[PDB]
Design a protein around this nucleic acid. Structure first.
Ligand SMILES: *[C@@H]1O[C@H](CO)[C@@H](O)[C@H](O)[C@H]1NC(C)=O
Ligand SMILES: *[C@@H]1O[C@H](CO)[C@@H](O)[C@H](O)[C@H]1NC(C)=O
Lengths: 107, 98, 577, 94, 79, 94, 108, 97, 79
DNA sequence: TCGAGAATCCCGGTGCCGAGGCCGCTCAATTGGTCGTAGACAGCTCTAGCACCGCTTAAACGCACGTACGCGCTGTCCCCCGCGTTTTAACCGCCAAGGGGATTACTCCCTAGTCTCCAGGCACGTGTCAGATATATACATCCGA
DNA sequence: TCGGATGTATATATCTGACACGTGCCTGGAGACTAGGGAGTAATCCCCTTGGCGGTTAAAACGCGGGGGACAGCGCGTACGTGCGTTTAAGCGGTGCTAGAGCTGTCTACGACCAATTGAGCGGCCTCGGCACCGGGATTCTCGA
């Protein structure tokens, strides 16, 4: 037969198209799953992951640390209005809290 | 000797604790409390250490959010000292006791 | 100006109510950072030999362009997601926001020592000094011509010299509509009340329009070759005829204006000529803004950079300065790296056009006869649509065609675009690369290792340190280009920061933004959001096969090319009134 | 042991594409895996609801696009939508 | 077993300081302990029921994560 | 038109069982139908997710009972569970 | 064959067993649905509906009205602690609000 | 001249409106506002009358809950009158800002 | 300027139903802003739902669908 | 402004455990056909939403007022903070028993699927009776006196 | 404290249209099978949980001193609730028009499904360097003159 070519290579994405399609089909979401839905879902997931990873890397570089730790992840997520709105009710383990103090409490 | 005026080292502690990511509640007392609480639902229950750690993180996050809202209520009430009625009002507004 | 106006002025006057001078033409550039001149009043670095920049000697722009950007032209790597249309639209957009005037050689024949021929270092001449071992010119006595930028406020050496902006700061499609009232008056015909723009009365392309001819004392178009006798085209910018691709884009815009005016006259015969012209100008400006902020910016900054620097439009804000930043002039010229050594021309089958389908860029600059007498703008547009752009690589910054043999036919010797850009940056006296990194908030490298880490290439860091010595001595253009690309973008983080900030300032400060309430009818924006570049090329150009949405990305045939009928036409039924 | 499936390799590939030198930790890997699983679950649930919701038995690209537009707030959604469309377009090409 | 005193007064003080509280009264600790007990009771009940269905005698971290997700306080970093 | 199935006569039968005299208006009919649909959807979704957690692809009485115990708060849940058990028993004997 | 008896009659339930089973099977909840799950669901739904409707009828009788209007249903839902917890984030159309005033706002 | 002291018929109105179940927002202005807001997203939009009614009911419920929480905040602040700061604080605590 | 259609007596009546005795003069502007924000969110969700179904009429069924999505599910208007 | 002082921040060596990379291989993704059907599309219809149009009239608007209240200022004391000291057990590092999570094989019983048919549930059409709408009455309740 | 003023729950007619009922019809729920695989149940492996030991020392508890702010008077400007006179579109009720929501009939191409193939990713096993810890010096904010 023809040489194997992963669906991620065809779509140009890095996330697994086949795994997403299998999860959608076997996730009890719909009786049938279209051939274009998993590619779109993988693209959206990859874009969101790239956004969060880039913000976390920026925060880590600002903190003079090479490796990304959950504190950097929380600093990146909570400092972005859109991402904060998305993860409104999500607690990140060992994430800490944004450094802030009320104006009146200051001397 | 050197005696810092009241309200000074409190701000330093606030700045230090808002910069770190450690766990503020001691591990063993929290684990024992979790075991005692679960004792009322099923006898002879074994807890994974990861489960206790996740419970501790969730409790710490919830308590921190509640304290933030209570501090907001207190600063709204023209006060800088948090009082239990502020905690009750914050819980009522958030929708837990309502 | 009266408080009840709904069309932009030609000069952009009173665009901001608080300050009428904001964004107006013939005004000084706004400075984000304080000037970094040589003596602190008015002098470029390198003017006086022996003076060091922050303790390190300054490097010649030609010297730093010889061994940093220059790379063999046989190892070109085409960009698989960038079309030549992308670079062409970038250049056209740059031809709208800024144009730094220079004193004329004829007017400076007495004290300006005709810098175009001689290179004695007297004002307003700032010649590029030459290093040894130069591949092109082995003689050290030679000199690349260069003209000092015109000052803003002439007088004593009390204030730092600025630069004058000769174009409207706002994005109002001024590249083909002009920027001054005398320029706009003769740019539109008054023979009738149709409201159309000027159309050439000598040569036509298959019954379609072209830019009107112009007459100058020393026309560079006539110097291409004397067997042509085709003059330079006249449009909203003097350099509209610099390249045939740019003038074909201007031809497309002029044809769009003419077609829109004709369609509006057909829809509303009772409207007068001036009202029709103003409506067409407003719609074309909204078109240009929509295309730039929907199809071009997402393909430049990247999803992260645009989302961080270009948030969702809330409302018009009059507190943001809409003037062109002095660093934007030297930062948006990154498109020189995306240029290609050859210009391509294709048929309706998208195949090479005889006799010269792949013409070197050396024999194409200031060639207005190619558009007029070699098939028109159809093959030029086809080549721009179906030719991949050159990928911006650290060791492949710019091709040698624009680096060694640019403007060869016009001037006595060929110029060098990268060294020209760096010399312009030094003339404007903008701070170093490190200072702009500090301004954008990014980390500021100080040693060789830190520069290699931030640029992700130790070899290029060593190459840069061999010339500049310190990161603070790096010019803005080289530092911006040499930075690693973003994700799904084409510029470095510093260039992304600068471009995003400037475009956010231009959009927020625009009182005539297409999304701003009042400027456009609340129902017309839905019809205007359906416009797209390939559809309008289909409408105003004889070709029948174009690219899909986001034309700047599709660069293959016939993998992602569709017919004209598929694209939805622009609906003007809401303009009946 | 069994084969448990996680998104570690894909998130690491994305990080390497974005930051060629920055590394990641095990806790951050677990956090990203949980986040991607949660976002995928939310989008798939919204799409399943929408598919069943107009009496349709299939999930197409339109359902996923509408779910992304509904869930993701603000400019993010638009960008994501564009990205999604682009991906589908490539499958149309090849 | 009166083990609710395991969360000491300095622990609640540290939590408040993390939350951004400058002055803490003396009657807050009882209320904080009660609130923590209520929240732990709810989450533990949900997790214990989840474990009860699966015929297991060990409450894994996955059950606690699922209970928190159901309660509207989805927790990342454990699966 | 077309058949639009809804819990209309069942709520009335329950009312007749409980209150042999009082009726119920159309707006309260719609409110009761919406409440029944919402509770059914919540319990079914909880049961589906809970069965998905244990890698079991079949929803049985145990999953529904556990979902009811998790979802309904306080004494109600216990009563509901008891009622459910009785119903299942009446199937087994008959 | 034999006389056809609805599955709701065998379980002694007034709610439809078959309709609940069909909805569970075709709602894409699980690949396979057991036999006892629809009956358990019908019993739970019947008990919940009976409780809320009994409370609504009590409120209506307290209001000297025969028919049950949405106001009575809202009063029954909100006046019961467990049902209030169950429907905490549920808005009933034309339901109103329970009559209450804070102690301090009372005139004195 | 029988003039009620400030704060009596206000409580009478409170009792009357809590005892009733009508709609306190005029139907036509709310419908016009809904149409104006919706037309910013898609022109030539047609709304069913039931759609306006449902939107009005949801809006009234949300506004009543917000006003109750704002009154609670004001009473906590040792005040009877509600102020915009109380509304902002209630919205911030609820999780909408 | 149509948001003024929410008359000041209407907001006063809503607050009276909510249980408010005295209302400041600056409350009305904030109430109008909050109402506009909430209506914008709900109407955007409903319009997206309607656009998905290739329909030009936004029904009440899609409105209650959007309200249920937002976490403010409403009864008496369908499901 | 101007010194002491204590906490915090900025650099130089240490090494260690977690992160990145490599190696088998196995189970999941791919390719190549098949076929049934869910959705796209064309046409028709007839709800039902949209656009004036006139008449009431409850409601909104605008204004005079004065009184309860928001807010500012001030005095008390006592509750909480800072800190020094002593007592408590949290924590760290092995160390062992084993309950139970986790995995695997047989099978058997239950649920998917199909054919049939008959009865429950729906939409129709309706007549009456809770209920909304006037109307006078007697309390329910508030404001100087 | 008691007589007058306003508001309203209450008892009494009087229509009224919403609904509970009766009925014809339709479609899907149920009876009666067949068939295959989900998982129930033994049976086994060894992972990680619990209980225990003992030493260090970080942390909690307790008490003393003091200061600042929570709270209660006290008063002053003001603004907004209350009522009256004026103005206004909301609502109602009809009327007409046509947009398109919804339904039905055809047809196709798109995804579920099955079989053979093979390689992408996961578990195990490494090897090394980023940083937590350790220490010492420079910086800075606080506080008493
Ligand atoms: C000179 O220009 C004319 C323009 O018509 C062109 O035809 C001709 O080929 C050119 N000659 C050369 C030598 O380039
Ligand atoms: C305009 O932008 C400035 C910052 O350039 C910001 O401070 C200001 O608030 C903005 N104005 C508005 C009306 O948003």
């Amino acid at each position: 037969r023809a040489k194997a070519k992963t669906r991620s290579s065809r779509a140009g994405l890095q996330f697994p198209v086949g795994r997403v399609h299998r999860l959608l089909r076997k996730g009890n979401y719909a009786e049938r799953v279209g051939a274009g839905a998993p590619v779109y879902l993988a693209a959206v997931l990859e874009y969101l992951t790239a956004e969060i990873l880039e913000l976390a890397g920026n925060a880590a570089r600002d903190n003079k640390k090479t490796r990304i730790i959950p504190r950097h992840l929380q600093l990146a997520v909570r400092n972005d209005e859109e991402l904060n709105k998305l993860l409104g009710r999500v607690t990140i383990a060992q994430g800490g809290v944004l450094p802030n103090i009320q104006s009146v409490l200051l001397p | 000797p050197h005696r810092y005026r009241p309200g000074t080292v409190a701000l330093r502690e606030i700045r230090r604790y808002q910069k770190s990511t450690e766990l503020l509640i001691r591990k063993l007392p929290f684990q024992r409390l979790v075991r005692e609480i679960a004792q009322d639902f099923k006898t002879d229950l074994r807890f994974q250490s990861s489960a206790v750690m996740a419970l501790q993180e969730a409790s710490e996050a919830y308590l921190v959010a509640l304290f933030e809202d209570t501090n907001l209520c207190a600063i709204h009430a023209k006060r800088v000292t948090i009082m239990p009625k502020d905690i009750q009002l914050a819980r009522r507004i958030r929708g837990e006791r309502a | 100006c009266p408080e009840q106006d709904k069309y932009r002025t030609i000069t952009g006057m009173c665009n901001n109510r608080r300050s009428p001078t904001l964004g107006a033409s013939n005004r000084a550039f706004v400075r984000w950072l304080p000037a970094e001149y040589e003596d602190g009043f008015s002098l470029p670095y390198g003017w006086t030999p022996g003076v060091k920049r922050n303790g390190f000697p300054v490097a010649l722009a030609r010297a730093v362009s010889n061994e940093i950007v220059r790379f063999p032209t046989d190892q070109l790597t085409p960009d698989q997601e960038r079309s030549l249309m992308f670079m062409q639209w970038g250049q056209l957009l740059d031809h709208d926001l800024d144009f730094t005037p220079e004193p004329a050689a004829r007017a400076s024949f007495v004290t300006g020592v005709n810098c175009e021929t001689s290179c004695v270092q007297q004002p307003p001449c700032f010649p590029l000094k030459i290093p040894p071992n130069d591949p092109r010119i082995k003689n050290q006595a030679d000199c690349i011509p260069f003209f000092r930028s015109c000052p803003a406020c002439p007088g004593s050496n009390i204030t730092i010299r600025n630069q004058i902006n000769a174009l409207t700061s706002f994005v109002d499609a001024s590249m083909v509509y002009g920027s001054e009232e005398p320029l706009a008056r003769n740019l539109r015909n008054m023979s009738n009340q149709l409201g159309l723009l000027a159309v050439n009365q000598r040569f036509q392309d298959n019954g379609r329009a072209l830019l009107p001819f112009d007459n100058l004392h020393d026309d560079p178009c006539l110097l291409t070759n004397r067997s042509a006798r085709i003059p330079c085209f006249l449009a909203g910018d003097t350099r509209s005829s610099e390249m045939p691709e740019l003038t074909s884009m201007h031809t497309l815009l002029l044809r769009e204006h003419n077609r829109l005016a004709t369609e509006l006259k057909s829809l509303n015969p009772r409207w007068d000529g001036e009202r029709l012209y103003q409506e067409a100008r407003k719609i074309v400006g909204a078109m240009v803004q929509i295309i730039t902020y929907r199809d071009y910016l997402p393909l430049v900054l990247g999803p992260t950079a645009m989302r961080k620097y270009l948030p969702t439009y809330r409302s018009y804000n009059d507190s943001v300065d809409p003037r062109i930043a002095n660093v934007f002039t030297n930062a948006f010229r990154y498109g020189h790296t995306l240029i290609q050594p050859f210009m391509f021309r294709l048929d309706n089958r998208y195949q090479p056009m005889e006799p010269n389908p792949r013409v070197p860029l050396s024999r194409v600059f200031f060639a207005s006869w190619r558009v007029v007498l070699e098939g028109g703008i159809d093959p030029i547009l086809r080549g721009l649509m179906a030719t991949p752009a050159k990928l911006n690589r650290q060791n492949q910054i710019a091709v040698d065609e624009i680096r060694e043999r640019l403007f060869e036919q016009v001037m006595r010797i060929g110029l060098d675009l990268p060294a020209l850009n760096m010399q312009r940056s030094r003339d404007h006296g903008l701070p170093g690369y490190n200072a702009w990194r500090r301004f954008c908030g990014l980390p500021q490298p100080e040693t060789v290792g830190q520069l290699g880490t931030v640029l992700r290439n130790l070899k290029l860091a060593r190459k840069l340190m061999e010339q500049y010595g310190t990161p603070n001595n790096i010019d803005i253009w080289m530092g911006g280009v040499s930075e690693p690309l973003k994700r799904k973008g084409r510029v470095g983080p510093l260039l992304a920061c600068i471009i995003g900030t400037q475009f956010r300032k231009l959009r927020d400060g625009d009182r005539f933004w297409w999304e701003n309430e009042g400027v456009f009818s609340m129902q017309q924006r839905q019809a205007l959001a359906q416009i797209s570049l390939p559809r309008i090329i289909c409408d105003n150009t004889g070709i029948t096969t174009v690219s899909k949405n986001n034309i700047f990305m599709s660069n293959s045939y016939p993998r992602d090319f569709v017919n004209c009928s598929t694209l939805p036409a622009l609906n003007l039924a809401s303009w009946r009134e | 042991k069994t084969r448990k499936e996680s998104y570690a390799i894909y998130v690491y590939k994305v990080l390497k594409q974005v930051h060629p030198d920055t590394g990641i930790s095990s806790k951050a890997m677990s956090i990203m895996n949980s986040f991607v699983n949660d976002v995928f679950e939310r989008i798939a649930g919204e799409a399943s609801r929408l598919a069943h919701y107009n009496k349709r038995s299939t999930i197409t690209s339109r359902e996923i696009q509408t779910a992304v537009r509904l869930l993701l707030p603000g400019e993010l959604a638009k960008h994501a939508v564009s990205e999604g469309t682009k991906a589908v377009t490539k499958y149309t090409s090849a | 077993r009166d083990n609710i005193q395991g969360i000491t007064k300095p622990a609640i003080r540290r939590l408040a300081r993390r939350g951004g509280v400058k002055r803490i009264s003396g009657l807050i600790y009882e209320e904080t302990r009660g609130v923590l007990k209520v929240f732990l009771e709810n989450v533990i009940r949900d997790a214990v029921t989840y474990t009860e269905h699966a015929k297991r005698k060990t409450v894994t971290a996955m059950d606690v994560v699922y209970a928190l997700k159901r309660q509207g306080r989805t927790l990342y970093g454990f699966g």
